[PDB]
Write an enzyme that holds these catalytic residues in place. Structure first.
Site, mmCIF file in Angstrom:
data_model
loop_
_atom_site.group_PDB
_atom_site.id
_atom_site.type_symbol
_atom_site.label_atom_id
_atom_site.label_comp_id
_atom_site.label_asym_id
_atom_site.label_seq_id
_atom_site.Cartn_x
_atom_site.Cartn_y
_atom_site.Cartn_z
ATOM 1 N N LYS A 99 9.712 19.868 -16.158
ATOM 2 C CA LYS A 99 8.080 18.771 -15.897
ATOM 3 C C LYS A 99 6.850 20.101 -16.678
ATOM 4 O O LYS A 99 7.102 21.588 -16.152
ATOM 5 C CB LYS A 99 7.877 18.197 -14.621
ATOM 6 C CG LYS A 99 8.285 17.207 -14.567
ATOM 7 C CD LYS A 99 8.045 16.050 -15.073
ATOM 8 C CE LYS A 99 8.853 15.058 -14.613
ATOM 9 N NZ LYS A 99 9.139 14.014 -15.775
ATOM 10 N N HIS A 159 4.956 13.409 -24.122
ATOM 11 C CA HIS A 159 5.551 12.731 -22.428
ATOM 12 C C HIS A 159 6.769 13.912 -22.377
ATOM 13 O O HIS A 159 8.012 14.167 -22.680
ATOM 14 C CB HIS A 159 5.939 11.162 -22.802
ATOM 15 C CG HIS A 159 6.989 10.542 -21.387
ATOM 16 N ND1 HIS A 159 7.578 9.519 -21.859
ATOM 17 C CD2 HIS A 159 6.778 11.226 -20.237
ATOM 18 C CE1 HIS A 159 7.770 9.393 -20.788
ATOM 19 N NE2 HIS A 159 7.577 9.830 -19.750
ATOM 20 N N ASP A 189 13.616 1.770 -13.039
ATOM 21 C CA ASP A 189 12.496 1.190 -13.704
ATOM 22 C C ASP A 189 12.440 0.526 -15.127
ATOM 23 O O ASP A 189 12.194 -0.415 -16.146
ATOM 24 C CB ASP A 189 11.168 1.529 -12.866
ATOM 25 C CG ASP A 189 10.831 2.281 -13.844
ATOM 26 O OD1 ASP A 189 11.187 3.604 -12.620
ATOM 27 O OD2 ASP A 189 10.018 2.076 -14.361
ATOM 28 N N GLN A 190 13.051 1.705 -16.046
ATOM 29 C CA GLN A 190 13.440 1.692 -17.357
ATOM 30 C C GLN A 190 13.923 0.783 -17.789
ATOM 31 O O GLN A 190 14.143 -0.055 -18.721
ATOM 32 C CB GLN A 190 13.099 2.565 -17.540
ATOM 33 C CG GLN A 190 12.929 3.329 -18.759
ATOM 34 C CD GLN A 190 13.414 4.547 -20.560
ATOM 35 O OE1 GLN A 190 11.970 4.636 -20.115
ATOM 36 N NE2 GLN A 190 14.237 5.173 -19.691
ATOM 37 N N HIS A 241 14.387 13.509 -9.364
ATOM 38 C CA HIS A 241 12.428 14.415 -9.530
ATOM 39 C C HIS A 241 12.200 13.386 -9.867
ATOM 40 O O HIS A 241 10.598 12.890 -9.694
ATOM 41 C CB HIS A 241 12.763 14.882 -10.693
ATOM 42 C CG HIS A 241 12.642 14.005 -12.371
ATOM 43 N ND1 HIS A 241 14.236 14.218 -12.670
ATOM 44 C CD2 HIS A 241 12.233 13.128 -12.822
ATOM 45 C CE1 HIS A 241 13.252 12.825 -13.882
ATOM 46 N NE2 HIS A 241 12.904 12.840 -13.523
ATOM 47 N N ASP A 243 3.178 12.386 -15.703
ATOM 48 C CA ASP A 243 4.326 13.767 -16.360
ATOM 49 C C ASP A 243 3.287 13.666 -18.433
ATOM 50 O O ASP A 243 4.650 13.508 -18.930
ATOM 51 C CB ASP A 243 5.856 14.120 -16.536
ATOM 52 C CG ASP A 243 6.425 12.505 -16.848
ATOM 53 O OD1 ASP A 243 5.434 11.731 -17.135
ATOM 54 O OD2 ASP A 243 7.899 12.914 -16.936
ATOM 55 N N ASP A 262 3.145 6.807 -17.866
ATOM 56 C CA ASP A 262 3.279 7.792 -17.102
ATOM 57 C C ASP A 262 2.939 8.983 -16.288
ATOM 58 O O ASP A 262 1.795 9.192 -16.362
ATOM 59 C CB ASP A 262 4.482 8.383 -16.870
ATOM 60 C CG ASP A 262 6.204 7.209 -17.031
ATOM 61 O OD1 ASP A 262 6.898 7.849 -17.255
ATOM 62 O OD2 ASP A 262 5.751 6.343 -15.922
ATOM 63 N N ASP A 322 13.049 5.003 -27.044
ATOM 64 C CA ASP A 322 13.804 5.953 -26.607
ATOM 65 C C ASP A 322 15.213 6.339 -27.920
ATOM 66 O O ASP A 322 16.129 6.128 -28.144
ATOM 67 C CB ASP A 322 13.731 5.513 -24.990
ATOM 68 C CG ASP A 322 14.895 6.651 -24.484
ATOM 69 O OD1 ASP A 322 15.118 7.197 -24.874
ATOM 70 O OD2 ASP A 322 13.907 6.974 -23.584
HETATM 71 O O1 LIG Z 1 7.346 12.331 -6.634
HETATM 72 C C1 LIG Z 1 6.522 11.513 -7.560
HETATM 73 C C2 LIG Z 1 7.668 11.310 -8.701
HETATM 74 C C3 LIG Z 1 7.238 10.230 -9.208
HETATM 75 N N1 LIG Z 1 5.812 9.163 -9.563
HETATM 76 C C4 LIG Z 1 6.663 8.377 -10.360
HETATM 77 O O2 LIG Z 1 7.447 7.959 -11.067
HETATM 78 C C5 LIG Z 1 7.577 8.117 -12.831
HETATM 79 C C6 LIG Z 1 8.018 7.894 -12.645
HETATM 80 O O3 LIG Z 1 9.050 9.578 -13.307
HETATM 81 P P1 LIG Z 1 9.046 10.578 -14.822
HETATM 82 O O4 LIG Z 1 7.476 10.420 -14.853
HETATM 83 O O5 LIG Z 1 8.989 12.242 -13.965
HETATM 84 O O6 LIG Z 1 10.000 9.932 -15.312
HETATM 85 P P2 LIG Z 1 11.471 10.077 -15.966
HETATM 86 O O7 LIG Z 1 10.124 10.135 -17.269
HETATM 87 O O8 LIG Z 1 12.215 11.456 -16.199
HETATM 88 O O9 LIG Z 1 11.649 9.203 -16.141
HETATM 89 C C7 LIG Z 1 12.061 7.423 -17.478
HETATM 90 O O10 LIG Z 1 12.649 6.794 -16.379
HETATM 91 C C8 LIG Z 1 11.991 6.839 -15.537
HETATM 92 C C9 LIG Z 1 13.018 5.404 -14.481
HETATM 93 O O11 LIG Z 1 12.868 5.388 -13.024
HETATM 94 C C10 LIG Z 1 10.514 5.806 -15.200
HETATM 95 O O12 LIG Z 1 10.739 4.876 -15.513
HETATM 96 C C11 LIG Z 1 9.499 6.625 -16.760
HETATM 97 O O13 LIG Z 1 8.427 6.031 -17.158
HETATM 98 C C12 LIG Z 1 11.034 6.914 -17.608
HETATM 99 F F1 LIG Z 1 10.623 7.617 -19.104
HETATM 100 C C13 LIG Z 1 5.840 9.513 -12.468
HETATM 101 O O14 LIG Z 1 5.476 9.081 -14.233
HETATM 102 C C14 LIG Z 1 4.930 8.395 -11.722
HETATM 103 O O15 LIG Z 1 4.230 7.620 -11.796
HETATM 104 C C15 LIG Z 1 5.617 9.817 -8.326
HETATM 105 O O16 LIG Z 1 4.563 9.042 -7.860
HETATM 106 N N2 LIG Z 1 5.801 11.333 -7.240
HETATM 107 O O1 LIG Z 2 14.990 7.549 -21.291
HETATM 108 C C1 LIG Z 2 14.784 9.008 -20.658
HETATM 109 C C2 LIG Z 2 15.471 9.461 -19.759
HETATM 110 C C3 LIG Z 2 14.923 8.814 -18.642
HETATM 111 C C4 LIG Z 2 15.330 9.082 -17.191
HETATM 112 O O2 LIG Z 2 14.781 8.533 -16.397
HETATM 113 C C5 LIG Z 2 14.818 11.263 -17.630
HETATM 114 O O3 LIG Z 2 15.666 11.416 -16.245
HETATM 115 C C6 LIG Z 2 16.132 11.688 -18.815
HETATM 116 O O4 LIG Z 2 15.743 13.190 -18.937
HETATM 117 C C7 LIG Z 2 15.762 13.455 -19.911
HETATM 118 C C8 LIG Z 2 15.334 14.065 -21.156
HETATM 119 O O5 LIG Z 2 14.536 13.078 -21.832
HETATM 120 C C9 LIG Z 2 16.321 15.312 -22.127
HETATM 121 O O6 LIG Z 2 15.927 15.080 -22.845
HETATM 122 C C10 LIG Z 2 16.949 16.168 -21.626
HETATM 123 O O7 LIG Z 2 18.021 16.667 -22.528
HETATM 124 O O8 LIG Z 2 18.126 15.696 -20.521
HETATM 125 C C11 LIG Z 2 17.242 14.921 -19.290
HETATM 126 C C12 LIG Z 2 17.951 14.158 -18.205
HETATM 127 O O9 LIG Z 2 18.525 15.700 -17.503
HETATM 128 O O10 LIG Z 2 15.161 10.910 -20.176
HETATM 129 MN MN LIG Z 3 7.270 10.609 -17.450
#
Ligand SMILES: O=c1ccn([C@@H]2O[C@H](COP(=O)(O)OP(=O)(O)O[C@H]3O[C@H](CO)[C@H](O)[C@H](O)[C@H]3F)[C@@H](O)[C@H]2O)c(=O)[nH]1
Ligand SMILES: OC[C@@H]1C[C@H](O)[C@@H](O)[C@H](O[C@H]2[C@H](O)[C@@H](O)[C@H](O)O[C@@H]2CO)O1
Ligand SMILES: [Mn+2]
Length: 278
Positions: free
Chosen positions: A246, A240, A188-189, A78, A105, A103, A130
């Site tokens: 999402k 978040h 990146d995290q 994703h 989301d 972010d 986290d």
């Molecule tokens: O189609 C997309 C997908 C992602 N993004 C960017 O990438 C960020 C990355 O992902 P999510 O917010 O969906 O990430 P997630 O919250 O699931 O994951 C955890 O791990 C990720 C790892 O790569 C990021 O570091 C993120 O901040 C952290 F919370 C987004 O906020 C967005 O700025 C886009 O611009 N377009």
């Molecule tokens: O640090 C959190 C971590 C980041 C990763 O990029 C993201 O895909 C991921 O998802 C978890 C979510 O936080 C949990 O609540 C859920 O149960 O599982 C997903 C993983 O599939 O979260």
């Molecule tokens: Mn996010």
């Protein structure tokens, strides 16, 4: 305050909703948006701007070359490569000594002032812990972290940009990736945690309330500081939705997701092409 978002064209509509949640939460604060633009169309930039305060007078799009981070791992489906743009923040923004990165989301539900007003000292940034990764026993250690250094989520970051500009964060990132590329699971995290461990100011979880924080309502540590930061002090300031589920998708059961649709419906201008994703 200066807010930073990063988005590609696919996330332009979501960026707009997230940005408006920030404005809604700060009725009397100037909100200057800085968008790390990885390819948003002219039409989508105009649409985003048109829905913000003043017709979008407080938003600047900064072109970033997504190919810059091509060699970095991209295993989480994703997530697009734009997720790495934040690493070059020191190169992209010159006018700010401090910025608050969010972010896409996220849904801001309460004032960010307390976070914004936090003094980072000589720390690299301020971020919330986290719980999901911290309870992944042994993981933190795989990327060189100690038991007492808490893994933070990269979705909400108060950045000491002035400090970042004194270093070459991208070079340090590439070097770290070379060293941990076979074990990193969070892209990146992981990099941010690896590079800044020991130099992180921890913010209360109210500023990065994720699914795990919700479920958490046994702590991984007895450390009083850890417990103070992970115990969310109500009300939630930032929801978040990390992970594949999402608020803009179907059957999102995450807490507070309905505020997303509520904001989307309040949009001033909604392009025919945004009707689908919103
Ligand atoms: O189609 C997309 C997908 C992602 N993004 C960017 O990438 C960020 C990355 O992902 P999510 O917010 O969906 O990430 P997630 O919250 O699931 O994951 C955890 O791990 C990720 C790892 O790569 C990021 O570091 C993120 O901040 C952290 F919370 C987004 O906020 C967005 O700025 C886009 O611009 N377009
Ligand atoms: O640090 C959190 C971590 C980041 C990763 O990029 C993201 O895909 C991921 O998802 C978890 C979510 O936080 C949990 O609540 C859920 O149960 O599982 C997903 C993983 O599939 O979260
Ligand atoms: Mn996010």
């Amino acid at each position: 305050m200066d807010i930073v978002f990063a988005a590609d064209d696919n996330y332009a509509a979501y960026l707009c909703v997230a940005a408006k949640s920030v404005e809604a939460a700060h009725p009397d604060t100037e909100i200057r948006f800085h968008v790390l633009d990885a390819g948003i169309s002219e039409a989508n930039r105009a649409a985003v701007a048109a829905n913000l305060r003043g017709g979008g007078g407080n938003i600047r799009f900064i072109d970033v070359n997504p190919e810059d981070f091509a060699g970095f791992p991209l295993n989480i489906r994703h997530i697009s490569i734009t997720t790495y743009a934040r690493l070059k923040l020191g190169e992209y923004i010159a006018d700010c000594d401090k910025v608050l990165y969010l972010d896409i989301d996220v849904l801001v539900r309460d004032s960010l002032t307390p976070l914004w007003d936090t003094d980072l000292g000589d720390n690299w940034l301020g971020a919330s812990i986290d719980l999901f990764v911290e309870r992944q026993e042994g993981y933190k250690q795989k990327i060189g972290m100690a038991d007492g250094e808490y893994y933070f989520n990269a979705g909400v970051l108060l950045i000491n940009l002035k400090k970042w500009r004194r270093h070459d964060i991208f070079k340090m990132s590439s070097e770290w990736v070379e060293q941990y590329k076979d074990v990193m699971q969070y892209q990146d995290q992981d990099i941010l945690n690896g590079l800044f461990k020991g130099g992180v100011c921890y913010a209360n979880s109210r500023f990065n309330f994720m699914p795990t924080n919700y479920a958490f309502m046994a702590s991984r540590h007895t450390d009083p500081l850890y417990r103070d930061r992970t115990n969310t002090v109500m009300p939630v300031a930032v929801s978040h939705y990390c992970g594949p589920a999402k608020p803009w998708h179907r059957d999102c059961t995450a807490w507070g997701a309905e505020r997303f649709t509520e904001l989307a419906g309040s949009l001033t201008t909604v392009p025919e092409e945004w009707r689908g994703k919103l």
